[PDB]
Amino acid sequence: AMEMNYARFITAASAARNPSPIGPKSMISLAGGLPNPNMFPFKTAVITVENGKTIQFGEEMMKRALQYSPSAGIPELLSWLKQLQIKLHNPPTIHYPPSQGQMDLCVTSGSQQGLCKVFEMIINPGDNVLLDEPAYSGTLQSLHPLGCNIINVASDESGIVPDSLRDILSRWKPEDAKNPQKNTPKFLYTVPNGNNPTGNSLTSERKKEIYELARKYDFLIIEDDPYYFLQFNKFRVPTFLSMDVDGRVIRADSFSKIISSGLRIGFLTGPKPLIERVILHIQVSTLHPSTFNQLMISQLLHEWGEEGFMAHVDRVIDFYSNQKDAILAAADKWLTGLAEWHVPAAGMFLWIKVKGINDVKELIEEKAVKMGVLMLPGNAFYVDSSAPSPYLRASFSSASPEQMDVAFQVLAQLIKESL
Amino acid sequence: GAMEMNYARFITAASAARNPSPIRTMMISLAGGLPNPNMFPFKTAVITVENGKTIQFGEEMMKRALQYSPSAGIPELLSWLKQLQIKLHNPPTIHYPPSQGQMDLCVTSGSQQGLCKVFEMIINPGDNVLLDEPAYSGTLQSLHPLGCNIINVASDESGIVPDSLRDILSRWKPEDAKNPQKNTPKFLYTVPNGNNPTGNSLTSERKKEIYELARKYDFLIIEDDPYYFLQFNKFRVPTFLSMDVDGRVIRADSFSKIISSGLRIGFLTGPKPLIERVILHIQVSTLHPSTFNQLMISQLLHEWGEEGFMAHVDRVIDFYSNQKDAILAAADKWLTGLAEWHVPAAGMFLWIKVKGINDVMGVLMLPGNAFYVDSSAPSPYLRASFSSASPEQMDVAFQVLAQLIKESL
Numbered sequence: 001a002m003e004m005n006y007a008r009f010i011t012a013a014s015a016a017r018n019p020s021p022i023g024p025k026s027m028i029s030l031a032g033g034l035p036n037p038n039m040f041p042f043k044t045a046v047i048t049v050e051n052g053k054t055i056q057f058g059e060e061m062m063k064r065a066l067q068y069s070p071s072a073g074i075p076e077l078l079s080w081l082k083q084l085q086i087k088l089h090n091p092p093t094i095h096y097p098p099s100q101g102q103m104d105l106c107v108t109s110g111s112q113q114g115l116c117k118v119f120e121m122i123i124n125p126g127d128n129v130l131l132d133e134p135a136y137s138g139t140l141q142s143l144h145p146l147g148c149n150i151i152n153v154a155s156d157e158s159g160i161v162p163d164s165l166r167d168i169l170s171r172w173k174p175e176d177a178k179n180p181q182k183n184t185p186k187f188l189y190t191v192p193n194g195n196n197p198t199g200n201s202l203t204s205e206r207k208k209e210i211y212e213l214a215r216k217y218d219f220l221i222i223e224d225d226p227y228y229f230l231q232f233n234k235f236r237v238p239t240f241l242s243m244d245v246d247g248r249v250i251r252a253d254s255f256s257k258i259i260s261s262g263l264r265i266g267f268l269t270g271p272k273p274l275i276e277r278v279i280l281h282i283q284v285s286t287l288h289p290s291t292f293n294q295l296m297i298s299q300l301l302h303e304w305g306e307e308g309f310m311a312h313v314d315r316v317i318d319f320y321s322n323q324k325d326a327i328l329a330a331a332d333k334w335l336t337g338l339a340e341w342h343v344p345a346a347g348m349f350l351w352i353k354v355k356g357i358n359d360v361k362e363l364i365e366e367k368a369v370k371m372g373v374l375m376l377p378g379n380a381f382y383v384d385s386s387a388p389s390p391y392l393r394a395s396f397s398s399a400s401p402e403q404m405d406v407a408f409q410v411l412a413q414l415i416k417e418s419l
Numbered sequence: 420g421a422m423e424m425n426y427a428r429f430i431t432a433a434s435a436a437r438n439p440s441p442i443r444t445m446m447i448s449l450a451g452g453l454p455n456p457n458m459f460p461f462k463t464a465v466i467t468v469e470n471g472k473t474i475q476f477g478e479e480m481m482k483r484a485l486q487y488s489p490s491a492g493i494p495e496l497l498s499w500l501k502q503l504q505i506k507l508h509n510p511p512t513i514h515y516p517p518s519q520g521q522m523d524l525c526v527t528s529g530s531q532q533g534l535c536k537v538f539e540m541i542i543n544p545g546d547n548v549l550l551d552e553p554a555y556s557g558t559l560q561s562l563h564p565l566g567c568n569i570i571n572v573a574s575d576e577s578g579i580v581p582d583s584l585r586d587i588l589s590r591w592k593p594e595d596a597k598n599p600q601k602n603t604p605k606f607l608y609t610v611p612n613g614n615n616p617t618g619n620s621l622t623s624e625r626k627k628e629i630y631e632l633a634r635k636y637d638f639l640i641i642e643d644d645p646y647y648f649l650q651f652n653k654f655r656v657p658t659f660l661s662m663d664v665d666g667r668v669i670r671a672d673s674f675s676k677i678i679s680s681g682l683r684i685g686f687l688t689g690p691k692p693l694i695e696r697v698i699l700h701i702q703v704s705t706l707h708p709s710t711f712n713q714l715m716i717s718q719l720l721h722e723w724g725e726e727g728f729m730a731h732v733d734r735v736i737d738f739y740s741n742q743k744d745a746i747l748a749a750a751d752k753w754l755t756g757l758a759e760w761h762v763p764a765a766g767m768f769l770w771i772k773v774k775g776i777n778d779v780m781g782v783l784m785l786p787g788n789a790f791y792v793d794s795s796a797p798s799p800y801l802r803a804s805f806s807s808a809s810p811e812q813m814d815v816a817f818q819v820l821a822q823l824i825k826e827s828l
């Protein structure tokens with residue numbers, strides 16, 4: 001375990017944040033001075049749940065659900081998720097001292113809130129960041145105003161190529177990480193399972209190689225992993241968090257694809273000194289994630305248990321895997337000869353390279369639309385969105401087999417008559 | 420008439436660099452990245468509402484509630500709130516061109532989210548900001564890491580004293596507002612009704628005097644108004660927004676004291692170029708406020724109508740006014756000649772100056788220290804909460820406080 005200097009990953013503004021000058025701690029007991037919840041108009045709730053179950057908010061629970069709650073999340077959700085992270089990832093940092101990157105969790109208002117806060121905590125203008133393009137548009141949109149240089153790491157069907165990362169890092173010496181003025185990268189960001197838009201996932205062996213490069217040049221890994229629970233291989237690949245001997249990994253998990261996107265509940269797992277910075281920023285922004293929505297999820301998860309949760313996840317994977325089977329069969333049918341793709345390892349996107357056409361934006365935004373078919377041009381997933389893209393992101397989250405037949409029959413036509 | 424605003428002046432390099440999503444460019448569509456909501460385990464909901472009513476999310480409505488939604492908020496809530504702001508405040512900027520500061524509204528994940536993003540949009544390190552201490556601890560905690568210099572404007576039982584502001588601003592010539600080296604204040608922040616922690620509220624005439632100075636030295640007014648709907652006398656004071664002929668007011672409204680604090684639904688009203696910067700920052704952080712929680716509130720507001728909402732607010736004001744009376748009666752009984760206090764005009768707090776002591780359950784009592792920029796400095800003040808203590812609890816709590824004061828003198 002290498003010693004971490006967390007202060008180098010914390011901006012002046014982030015470091016300046018202080019805890020508020022304001023038995024077992026609960027808002028039920030400690031909210032006497034906060035707004036009186038008897039004034040709130042919602043009184044009880046029943047929410048039906050799959051397999052003929054319910055969640056009930058009685059009068060007391062409704063008052064809690066409608067009241068303020070801690071910035072890091074409700075304690076019982078944090079506690080249940082801590083145990084989930086232990087079971088799934090057994091992170092090395094569980095019992096490290098706080099100052100050495102003890103594993104710490106924060107519930108966030110979506111995972112993207114967590115990620116944004118992490119990026120803001122770290123990045124000064126002119127810092128270098130590593131990621132693999134095509135990358136999620138939200139991440140690129142988030143990094144742009146922070147004024148970092150984004151250095152693109154090559155990727156393939158197995159995600160980031162370690163040799164590319166190695167080749168990028170050879171630009172510095174390892175000892176340059178001790179010299180702020182050398183500007184060695186502050187972090188590597190990646191989506192390690194079912195990258196949006198590619199559908200590609202890292203292997204265990206590559207993750208080990210990337211982790212060791214992160215030690216060698218002393219940078220953080222931001223493991224943005226919203227499709228962790230949507231891997232089609234039922235043996236889930238070990239995560240960067242699971243290898244994190246140094247406490248250099250910040251992991252973002254999301255409920256958005258398995259439980260609800262609209263509830264805006266995700267969570268960060270990472271070293272305590274960095275997670276604390278994020279919590280303090282949350283505390284002066286959203287204050288906390290919706291108490292009501294946390295209680296819906298926390299109650300569901302407590303009633304399910306870890307087995308029930310994982311069973312749910314399995315049923316979600318089964319649905320998306322059948323959808324993947326269907327979209328790959330339409331691709332096989334119509335696009336063989338006219339386009340390239342890999343089988344998605346996780347998530348909900350098929351990434352289609354159109355052969356013999358430099359850009360596909362006109363092909364969609366005039367020709368495909370007019371034929372009642374829309375897919376997404378690839379340009380949005382690069383730092384330079386004006387550069388030509390031969391790629392299309394096709395979602396298999398919703399469309400029927402019949403709809404995928406039509407869309408791809410229509411795409412095949414337009415590819416033929418555009419060559 | 421209306422002065423021309425240079426909104427660029429109030430937008431950092433970082434905030435100005437924010438761009439909209441290329442997926443904004445947008446029938447069998449495989450283009451979207453929405454997860455399939457049929458996979459989500461919550462299926463329907465029934466939520467009981469005060470005075471006998473129910474709110475129902477059927478199957479389709481539940482799938483919407485559990486799914487991503489627009490960044491500024493759901494259209495039904497946005498339109499209801501827009502019409503609320505037009506009716507209450509008649510903002511002079513309603514029909515201005517977008518670039519001249521047309522009134523815009525965003526639903527936020529609580530009002531504080533809106534305010535934080537506004538502060539972040541505006542402040543470079545070393546900028547001057549105006550506010551009245553004692554101030555909301557959360558605002559001070561938000562401003563500290565941005566590295567602004569907080570200039571304290573004097574205040575009293577009627578809030579900010581315009582003559583202090585006048586005197587403070589006279590340091591600059593008004594032309595200095597166009598000279599970045601002079602570092603004229605970028606904004607004035609205040610809580611105009613029921614200031615946390617003082618309980619004091621601005622008067623109509625002072626608000627007009629403050630606005631006049633804001634125009635002359637060209638600063639924004641950040642109107643943080645979460646106790647607007649807890650005005651005890653029920654004769655509403657005109658807002659800074661209602662006098663905002665220039666589009667220099669950003670207003671924060673909260674549902675935290677009247678509908679729910681825990682749902683994290685508030686709203687931000689302001690000039691479109693500034694509100695757009697806040698929306699773009701939201702788009703890369705929370706994305707939007709919870710769709711479920713927005714729908715709860717929107718369904719409620721629509722079954723109530725404006726009349727149901729105001730009847731609700733009316734009963735909430737009566738409850739807090741009755742609490743104010745009880746805490747004041749407790750204070751009269753136990754604290755006269757040991758302490759001093761003004762009658763709160765709104766909100767949830769009694770601010771108590773303890774006589775003789777240089778520096779300071781049931782009723783939460785917090786030292787005054789937490790409401791100043793310099794929290795290490797001695798404070799003879801206590802902030803006492805009256806949101807929930809019963810009359811018996813107030814009686815005991817102040818009996819105890821009187822004893823502690825007497826034996827410490």
Ligand SMILES: CC(C)[C@@H](Cc1nnc(NS(=O)(=O)c2cc(F)cc(F)c2)s1)c1cccc(F)c1
Nearest residue numbers: 020022025026027030068069070071072075287
């Ligand atoms: C919503 C606001 C009111 C809270 C949010 C908070 N965030 N973290 C907290 N930590 S705690 O007090 O130790 C705590 C831990 C629990 F597990 C349960 C509990 F009830 C209390 S309280 C707040 C924010 C800023 C200033 C302030 F005084 C209070």
Ligand SMILES: CC(C)[C@@H](Cc1nnc(NS(=O)(=O)c2cc(F)cc(F)c2)s1)c1cccc(F)c1
Nearest residue numbers: 022027030031033034035068287556557615783
């Ligand atoms: C979580 C607990 C620990 C807090 C509860 C609080 N009670 N009053 C508070 N006032 S505040 O920070 O100004 C505030 C008022 C609002 F209305 C909203 C808001 F976001 C913040 S915070 C606590 C702190 C100290 C002693 C104690 F008994 C309880």
Ligand SMILES: CC(C)[C@@H](Cc1nnc(NS(=O)(=O)c2cc(F)cc(F)c2)s1)c1cccc(F)c1
Nearest residue numbers: 137196440442450451452453454487488489706
């Ligand atoms: C109508 C609006 C509400 C939709 C429109 C969208 N449809 N597909 C998208 N694909 S995406 O950018 O790759 C994406 C995928 C996710 F799975 C999650 C995510 F946050 C973003 S964005 C929306 C949804 C979310 C955020 C947002 F800016 C716009």
Ligand SMILES: CC(C)[C@@H](Cc1nnc(NS(=O)(=O)c2cc(F)cc(F)c2)s1)c1cccc(F)c1
Nearest residue numbers: 503506507648650653654655725726729732733
């Ligand atoms: C809670 C009661 C006491 C109300 C009494 C009112 N005072 N002025 C009002 N103006 S209005 O144009 O009739 C009106 C009515 C609506 F139904 C909706 C709307 F947007 C505007 S209604 C109140 C609200 C806020 C602060 C306060 F001091 C008093």
